[PDB]
Amino acid sequence: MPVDRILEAELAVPVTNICQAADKQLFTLVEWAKRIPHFSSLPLDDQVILLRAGWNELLIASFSHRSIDVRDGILLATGLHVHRNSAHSAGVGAIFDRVLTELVSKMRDMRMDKTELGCLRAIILFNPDAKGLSNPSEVEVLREKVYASLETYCKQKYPEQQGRFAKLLLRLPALRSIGLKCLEHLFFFKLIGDTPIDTFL
Amino acid sequence: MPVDRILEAELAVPVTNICQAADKQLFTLVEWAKRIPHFSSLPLDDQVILLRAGWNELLIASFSHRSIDVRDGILLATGLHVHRNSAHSAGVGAIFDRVLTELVSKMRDMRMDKTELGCLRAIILFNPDAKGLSNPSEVEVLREKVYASLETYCKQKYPEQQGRFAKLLLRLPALRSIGLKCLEHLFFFKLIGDTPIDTFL
Amino acid sequence: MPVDRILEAELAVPVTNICQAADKQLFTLVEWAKRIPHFSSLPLDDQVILLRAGWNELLIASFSHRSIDVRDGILLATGLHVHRNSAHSAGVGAIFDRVLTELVSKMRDMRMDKTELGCLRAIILFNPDAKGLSNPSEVEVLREKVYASLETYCKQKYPEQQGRFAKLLLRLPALRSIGLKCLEHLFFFKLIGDTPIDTFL
Amino acid sequence: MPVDRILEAELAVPVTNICQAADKQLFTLVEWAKRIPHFSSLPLDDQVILLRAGWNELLIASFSHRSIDVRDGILLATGLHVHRNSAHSAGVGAIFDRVLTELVSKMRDMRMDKTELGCLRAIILFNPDAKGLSNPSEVEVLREKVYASLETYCKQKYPEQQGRFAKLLLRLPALRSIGLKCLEHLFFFKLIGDTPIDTFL
Amino acid sequence: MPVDRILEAELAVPVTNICQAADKQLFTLVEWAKRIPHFSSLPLDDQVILLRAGWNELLIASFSHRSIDVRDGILLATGLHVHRNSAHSAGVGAIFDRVLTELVSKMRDMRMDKTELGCLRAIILFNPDAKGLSNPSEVEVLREKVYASLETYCKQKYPEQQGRFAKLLLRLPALRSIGLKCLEHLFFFKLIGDTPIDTFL
Amino acid sequence: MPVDRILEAELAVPVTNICQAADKQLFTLVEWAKRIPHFSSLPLDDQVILLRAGWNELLIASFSHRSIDVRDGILLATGLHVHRNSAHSAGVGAIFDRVLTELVSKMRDMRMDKTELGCLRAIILFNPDAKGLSNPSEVEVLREKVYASLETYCKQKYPEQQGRFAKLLLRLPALRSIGLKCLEHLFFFKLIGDTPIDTFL
Amino acid sequence: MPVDRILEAELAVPVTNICQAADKQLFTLVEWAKRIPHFSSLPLDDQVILLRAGWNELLIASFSHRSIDVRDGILLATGLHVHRNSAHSAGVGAIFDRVLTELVSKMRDMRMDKTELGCLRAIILFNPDAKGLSNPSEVEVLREKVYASLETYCKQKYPEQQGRFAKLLLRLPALRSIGLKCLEHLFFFKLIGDTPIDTFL
Amino acid sequence: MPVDRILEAELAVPVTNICQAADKQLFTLVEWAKRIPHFSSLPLDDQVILLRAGWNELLIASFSHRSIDVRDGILLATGLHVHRNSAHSAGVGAIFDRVLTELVSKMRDMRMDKTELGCLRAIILFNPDAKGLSNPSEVEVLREKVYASLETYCKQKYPEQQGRFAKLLLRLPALRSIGLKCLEHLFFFKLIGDTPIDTFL
Numbered sequence A, B, C, D, E, F, G, H: 001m002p003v004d005r006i007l008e009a010e011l012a013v014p015v016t017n018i019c020q021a022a023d024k025q026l027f028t029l030v031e032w033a034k035r036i037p038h039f040s041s042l043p044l045d046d047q048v049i050l051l052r053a054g055w056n057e058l059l060i061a062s063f064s065h066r067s068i069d070v071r072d073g074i075l076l077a078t079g080l081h082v083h084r085n086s087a088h089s090a091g092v093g094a095i096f097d098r099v100l101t102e103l104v105s106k107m108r109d110m111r112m113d114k115t116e117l118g119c120l121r122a123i124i125l126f127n128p129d130a131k132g133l134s135n136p137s138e139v140e141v142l143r144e145k146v147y148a149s150l151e152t153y154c155k156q157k158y159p160e161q162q163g164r165f166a167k168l169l170l171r172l173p174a175l176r177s178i179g180l181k182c183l184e185h186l187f188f189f190k191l192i193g194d195t196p197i198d199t200f201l
Ligand SMILES: Cc1cc2c(cc1C1(c3ccc(C(=O)O)cn3)CC1)C(C)(C)CCC2(C)C
Pocket: A015, A018, A019, A021, A022, A025, A056, A057, A059, A060, A062, A063, A075, A076, A077, A078, A092, A095, A096, A099, A182, A185, A186
């Protein structure tokens, strides 16, 4: 798990606008995955499963980081902005605030670099809890390798900050909850979309 | 639009089982699209849009054809079978019958070849009605090229059958309706999945 | 299956206003059907079935064509207009746009004539996928006759445009989807009509 | 408004089976209406409106009468039977009992003839309460003519039975309520039809 | 069934306001019933059943008649008025219009007297279709007596108007439908009452 | 407030069966109320209001007491029984158990007499919290008179039991909750009654 | 069961604001309970059960009393106010009025002291109807002790008012109903909270 | 922030059974919190907020660990067992499997000790993402202290296992998701509880 090969993979890459943005990102997510050290060696079936389970947390981590320099807002993969106001107006205010508060702003205060982001992603990607994996222990092994390199990296680049490694990992539960919330809102809009119901709201 | 280029793209590639099957197929759908003659030259944004709008009709056409030699059933991209009985038992009986009646059996009686399938796919892929396309006329142009080559092909290989070209095109509306129905059932199961409600049925 | 006999059948003939319009059209739909070449020879039971399955696509095609010269709007069978604005205000904006974009405007650019419209209708009428038909192959035969005459007609009147026949057929899937959408909205309004709920919206 | 001409109009003509039955009957309802004395002279718009408002009461009166000689059941316009048992099993037990109790059996005890049935129908057809009629007073006039001839007829053929005329009219409110109930069940089945929900039931 | 004893019984007697009004009327409905000729002789159980089945049609007939001299409105048993405007604003516009159009205005044009009203009431009261009556034939007999006296009365007081009797009876189906509608709205308001839901609307 | 006047008023008087039972009881509830000391002197409007707010608690108290000698069951005002088993089978098990546990059995252990029951009733009847009362303090005054006589009575007949008066009053909150629950179940059954949904359970 | 020990337990201690207020109060509710005379001696299991069943009535009684000197409003345990206006604006108007009318204002007119409040609380706490109590009679015994001391206290401090004891107890049913209502609204807000639905309202 | 004091706090302490179990645990949760090093020094308001946000994850971690020696099941705080079978039968199968798979079994394979459990708990308790905290940075500081001691402890007791610390933290996202799922099921059961709906299930 050379952390360098991971950083390389990263570099290698309102509701209507946000969903199209997510789309653009999904269009090349398999490409990104294929760049992570041993992902390609996992059974093809284990690969789809890992991606199916982590796609939105992954994306939520990507756009969050990319938005570190946006004034109370998010920077879509599409180039457009979405600010706290539009989000509230669109009915996705509460979760949008979680994004800024729990992910964006906190990734900004730590000055979380790409290498670190990629790792967190790589980690969420190698999720042993993914249902139906052929060999879970295998997957487990690949993630402990990632956070091993990751902890090392953090010790090298940020020796003054000894608790950064943990601190980084502690952003994963926030990505977990936000993600579940994301999918819930996604259902809703998908359910009321293009029906007179939507015109209402 | 060389029809051979298309055929090459094709060759290049119960509810829980069916969804995992669809997943496996989505994992490489972009790859398939990238093999169609001029798809890659369309703006990236127009590419995601075309795929978002045609993914399930596309997949429904693929598994339908692949199932031509299955006794009252479907042959998943996963290798497993799903027969009319399991489908009814799973609550997806009515649409499952549409698949066999309107797509599978009719693709079987015509002895619809891969070249022809790929074209129909290529056609659904180049859908000018896709919302948000930058250059729609451009997309329109690419599909009329596909069905031009397609009609030619049909004239060459099946001269005795002069109405086959139309006959082929007339399977598209069935894919349209079945597809919409598919997504509806997909919502439902996605909606009650992993909830005590699912235990109920 | 002379195309002339079909053209003669054609010639032979906001939500509250739209529904009353649809009504006026249903009042004589059987008459129109009875004018199509061999429709009357099909078992009576097969006749009701064909009409039950195609009534709204049929009507949607009729009013769409009739609206070719309306500024961003639809020309009801009642003489009244309904413009993009009223539709959005009424909550049927999204589908109304599909009508104008996918049907009206595209029928207008092609300068789709009555003879061609009638055929498309005749074709949707002879739908072999109609559930419960006694003799499906019989119905299949009648539609391939229609599109045979239709392709011929298109070759005669528009020799310069060799792809027009296909192009015409490719409007059927749009009528399929729009139609299903239509029925869905119809349920909704039928469900909240004359109830305090409708007042609230 | 001769009762004879009415009688002539009449003579002139489980849930899946019942609905197809209703369909068969709708296929020629306009024909039946066109045979009633002055219906054809009413504005075309007033004609559609009258049929839209009375179609199911009308049909419910037709099949009820037709079922006078059926053992605890209904005789569909399709020839098939539906017995109290199938109806209960299908979830339409309560209203089905109203049909037999309030309409069928009571039409059977009175030995209600076709002439009388036709009139009741003609009466429901000329409904001044129909929303949107151009000239309601005109419609009102046509119905009082019908029940005028009807009362006369009843005095002629059944002199010993002086209260029969009223007795007949008093079956109209039962047709009204049953009809509204019918449409409600119709929504429900149309709403859960061909969806996994249906399979559950 | 002396019609006089009936008239005697009659003489003997916005949503929040309307319901309290209905209440006031229910408080003495048994009293009114007890005044109808043979009602008291029917088994006590048959009496509750008749009242349970006819209470709202009865009341709807009472307030409708009482409102004959109100400008586009209803005169509650409470003395207060409710005009077409408040009703629409309250979400009960559609049914409120049926009341005025189908009942009030039509009772006004005929100059329907109390004696006639009472009879219609007495008639709805003696409803043989009431579920669970011990002796229905008995009830049937009492209603044919009422409309016998009623027809006689109409012949005496209004000899020039020979069709008035029928005309009167023909208002019963309108009371039937309006009544069912009434109960439906009643459920709704009872369902959303005193919940933040109501504050909304 | 003579307690004897009250006792005199009292003496003066599965889901389908239970509701018909409640009906029988409502048929004469006004009569019972009119027998309570000063109820008749309250404005008529205040009378309907008190009855509207207390009808089910009142009835629930009546049938509960009447059921003191029933083996795990309730004795309807109709003479029929309903036992813990039928209730559970009917879906009203939980509340039915509250009736037996909180009301019946506890009224049985205390050997709660009619005089005491009537009072509790009289008390619930004179409810100052009833919304819309003209003179609330007046109503308040009448209930404190009732429980004054009540406490006296309890001191006279049961001198050994000094806490019985309180104990009696402490059964009112149980009648309050059970009552609200009752109305809720009543909505539900009223909501799915006579619909295929009811056939379902 | 000295009333003094209870008074000492008491002394010992817009929707978003109200819920946080309730929270603050729950944070120390067990502490309060542990201060009531024999509560701690009851099986631990019986203790949780009593608190689970009475927590909101208890809290509702606490904040109501604490609000005796607030102009048409409530004084949260948080120090903040919530006035009749904010409540209506928040959709909790109806129940909020019940609080002021049935609890606050009435506790204010009686000049209900802390000792008396505590008792009422202690009483609701020792609720024998609590489902699953191991020894119910035990609990029953503890509440009759409370209202025994309470009645005594009321006789001592307020000899001129002999009906005060009853009067106090008669506030319990109002706390029962208001409480059930409270929980219902609580579900609703908990159900639509942080969802686009809450935004819309 | 000595891990010892944490360990000491820990030591210091089917759906109907599970909820009563959760209850028993809530009854003393504040006590447990008060034992964590600096929790008591945080503003009282910050204390309630932290507990409100972490109560179920906390409990879910407690019962999970406690269940390490249960054959395919959970060991309630009540002493009772709940096995995979009862859970599925109760409709909570899917989440129950997540508990065993993601928490129980994985806590069992690592041989996760109490000291480590307590820490994870202490960590979830000091959640800076808790909405409405007065001083979040303060809370953040307390959690980094906990995982600092925790990492140290893990290095001391398990020197051969260098990745255990991370491995432990990586169980937090699973607790997050499971927790959200838990609350969702909790709503559902609370919503259909004690209603005929419950009896159906
Ligand atoms: C689709 C989607 C929808 C939403 C969100 C996130 C996404 C995701 C995503 C990921 C990446 C990008 C991008 O890079 O531009 C855009 N979107 C899919 C996770 C949040 C959380 C903002 C709440 C608002 C809604 C509308 C519910």
